[PDB]
C-alpha cells in the first residue's frame, strides 16, 4: 500500500492539518431573527479576525445580545445596524435580496432563508443583484456564476471590508509562514515529483517528471485524483 | 367461523399492505423513527403475535420495540494481503439475521431480564422494527408462573446471546430435522462451524 496522499492525511483529521480553532474570534453569521421580526444594533468596535485576516465588527443589538458580525467596507463605530425586511437598503444593513435594487453590491449572502450567510465573505469580495422574479432572484457571484437564490435570502449591503489584501506580494517565506501559523493549511508543501513512488502517483524516476498525464479523470478513486482534476482544458490562454 | 378477535388481528396483519395496517403504518413510522434504538411500549403492536409467542398480561414481562438497520453485516475491506476470495466484502452478508441483532440489543439494554421471542412489526427503506418480549426472572410473579418459571434456571440466563431464541435456533439451522442438519444439530460449533 503506497503511502496515503496529503489529502487523505488531511481528511483523516490529524493535528498537522487541523485548524487552530481556539485562535479565532467568533463564528460569523447573521443574527437569528424570527419571521416578520427585526432588531437594531450599534457598532461598539472594529476588531481583527485571525480566521479571515479581515476586520469584524462587534455589534450590540437592542436585546443585549453582543454578536460579532462580518464587517462590510465603510462600517464604523457608533453606526446603527438594522435587520429585517423593513430595514432600509443601506450599507452594513441585513435585508433580503428581494428588496435590494438590481445593480447593488451585497455580501455574506445566505444560500437559504435564515441561513446565516455562506457566500461572498472573503476580504473585499462582493456580489451583484442581477434580476428579480417572483420565486427567484439572480446574484452575480465573485466567481462569475449567476447563482439563483430565494427572494428571502438575507445579505449585508456593501462589499466586504479588507479589500486589497492580496495586492501585496508575500515577498518572503516567513511572511507566508506567519499567515499559515493561524491557518489550517500545511506549510511548506513538497512537490509531488520530488516524492518517492510510494508517496505519490507522480513520484519516483531517475529524473523529475510525472510519467503519466496530469489530467486525472473525475471517476478516479481517492488517493489517485491528483494533478489536474477533471480539467476541461489546460495551459495558458493561447 | 366463531373466531376470536386475535384471529381478526392476525387476518389484518397477514397482508399488511392491503389492509387498514397500511394507514396505521404511514401514521406510526413517523413516531417510530423519532424514538430511540430500544424503546419501551405499553402494549404490543400486534397482540395476537405476542400472545402466541408467549406474552401474558402479567407483571414481570416487558415488551420493547427495537430499531435495527437494514442490510447485511457491513464489513471493512482488509488492509493486508488476502487471496482474492477473502478480499471482497460488499456482497457478503453475515450469518447474523436482523431479528437476532434486535434481540441481542434488547438483551443488552435490559440486563436483568431475558429475551423470550420477537416479531417483525414494521419496516421502511432504512430500518426494521422488531418488538422483543422480555421476562423478569427475579420478579415473584414469574417465579410463581409455572409456564414461565423455566427461565429462573441458570442455563437460561443469556438466551439471545447464546442463540437459544427462536430466531437464534432458526439462524443455527435447527428449524428442521433430517437431511440438511447433519452439520448443524446439536450445534454449529460442534462440527467446526461447517453447517451454516
Amino acid at each position: 500500500m503506497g503511502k496515503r496522499l496529503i489529502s487523505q492525511n488531511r481528511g483523516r483529521g490529524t493535528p498537522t492539518y487541523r485548524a487552530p480553532s481556539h485562535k479565532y474570534k467568533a463564528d460569523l453569521r447573521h443574527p437569528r431573527v424570527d419571521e416578520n421580526s427585526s432588531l437594531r444594533g450599534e457598532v461598539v468596535g472594529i476588531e481583527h479576525d485571525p480566521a479571515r485576516s479581515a476586520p469584524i465588527a462587534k455589534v450590540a443589538f437592542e436585546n443585549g445580545e453582543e454578536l460579532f458580525l462580518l464587517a462590510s467596507e465603510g462600517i464604523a463605530v457608533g453606526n446603527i445596524i438594522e435587520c429585517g425586511d423593513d430595514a432600509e437598503v443601506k450599507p452594513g444593513n441585513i435585508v433580503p435580496i428581494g428588496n435590494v435594487p438590481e445593480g447593488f453590491f451585497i455580501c455574506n449572502v445566505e444560500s437559504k432563508p435564515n441561513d446565516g450567510g455562506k457566500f461572498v465573505r472573503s476580504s473585499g469580495v462582493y456580489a451583484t443583484v442581477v434580476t428579480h422574479e417572483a420565486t427567484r432572484t439572480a446574484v452575480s457571484m465573485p466567481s462569475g456564476n449567476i447563482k439563483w437564490l430565494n427572494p428571502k435570502c438575507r445579505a449585508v449591503v456593501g462589499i466586504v471590508a479588507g479589500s486589497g489584501r492580496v495586492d501585496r506580494p508575500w515577498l518572503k517565506a516567513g511572511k507566508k509562514y506567519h499567515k499559515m501559523k493561524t491557518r489550517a493549511a500545511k506549510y511548506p508543501r513538497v512537490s509531488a515529483v520530488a516524492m518517492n513512488p510510494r508517496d505519490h502517483p507522480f513520484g519516483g524516476g531517475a529524473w523529475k517528471h510525472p510519467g503519466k498525464p496530469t489530467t486525472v479523470s473525475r471517476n478516479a478513486p481517492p488517493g489517485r485524483k491528483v494533478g489536474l482534476i477533471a480539467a476541461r482544458r489546460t495551459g495558458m490562454k493561447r | 367461523m366463531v373466531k376470536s378477535f386475535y384471529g381478526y388481528v392476525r387476518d389484518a396483519w397477514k397482508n399488511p399492505d392491503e389492509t387498514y395496517v397500511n394507514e396505521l403504518r404511514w401514521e406510526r413510522l413517523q413516531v417510530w423513527r423519532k424514538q430511540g434504538s430500544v424503546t419501551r411500549i405499553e402494549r404490543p403492536t400486534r397482540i395476537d403475535r405476542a400472545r402466541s409467542l408467549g406474552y401474558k398480561a402479567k407483571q414481570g414481562i416487558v415488551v420493547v420495540r427495537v430499531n435495527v438497520r437494514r442490510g447485511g453485516l457491513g464489513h471493512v475491506r482488509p488492509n493486508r494481503g488476502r487471496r482474492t476470495q477473502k478480499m471482497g466484502k460488499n456482497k457478503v452478508s453475515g450469518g447474523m439475521s436482523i431479528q437476532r441483532i434486535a434481540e441481542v440489543r434488547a438483551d443488552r439494554r435490559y440486563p436483568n431480564l431475558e429475551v423470550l421471542n420477537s416479531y417483525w412489526v414494521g419496516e421502511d427503506g432504512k430500518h426494521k422494527w422488531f418488538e422483543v418480549i422480555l421476562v423478569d426472572p427475579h420478579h415473584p410473579v414469574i417465579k410463581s408462573d409455572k409456564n414461565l418459571n423455566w427461565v429462573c434456571d441458570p442455563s437460561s440466563r443469556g438466551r439471545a446471546t447464546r442463540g437459544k431464541t427462536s430466531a437464534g435456533r432458526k439462524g443455527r439451522g435447527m428449524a428442521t430435522r433430517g437431511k440438511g442438519t447433519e452439520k448443524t444439530r446439536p450445534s454449529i460449533r460442534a462440527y467446526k462451524s461447517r453447517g451454516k
Partner: protein
C-alpha cells in the same frame, strides 16, 4: 359516518349500566367479537381510545355485517366503570337487555336513523 349525538351516547352508557344491573353483557373485545359472531349482540359499544388500533378495528364492519348496532364511546375508562370494572374496557356487548330493552331498541333506532 355522521357523528352520533352526545345524548345518544349518554343513553347508551346508562343502558349499559342497566344491562349490567339486570341483563347479560359481554365486556372486552374477545367476548364482544364472539357475541357478535354468534348473533347475540343487542348493542355494541366501542372505545375510541384504543392503542394499538388493531384491538377493536375489526369490530365495526364485523358488527355491521352481523346486524348488530354499534356505538362509539369517547374513551374506555368510563366504559370499563359503566361495565362494572375498575380498568379499561375497549368494548362491551349487550346480549340480554333485561329491564332496559326498550331504551336499547330506541338507541338502535336512533343509530340506524343517524347512520
Amino acid at each position: 359516518k355522521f357523528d352520533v349525538p352526545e345524548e345518544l351516547t349518554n343513553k347508551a352508557l346508562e343502558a349499559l349500566e342497566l344491562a349490567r344491573d339486570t341483563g347479560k353483557i359481554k365486556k372486552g373485545t374477545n367476548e364482544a367479537t364472539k357475541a357478535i359472531e354468534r348473533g347475540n349482540a343487542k348493542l355494541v359499544l366501542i372505545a375510541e381510545d384504543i392503542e394499538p388500533a388493531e384491538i377493536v378495528a375489526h369490530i365495526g364492519p364485523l358488527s355491521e355485517e352481523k346486524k348488530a348496532p354499534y356505538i362509539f364511546i369517547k374513551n374506555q375508562k368510563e366504559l370499563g366503570a359503566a361495565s362494572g370494572l375498575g380498568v379499561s374496557c375497549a368494548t362491551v356487548a349487550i346480549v340480554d337487555a333485561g329491564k332496559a330493552a326498550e331504551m336499547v331498541q330506541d338507541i338502535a333506532q336512533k343509530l340506524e336513523a343517524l347512520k
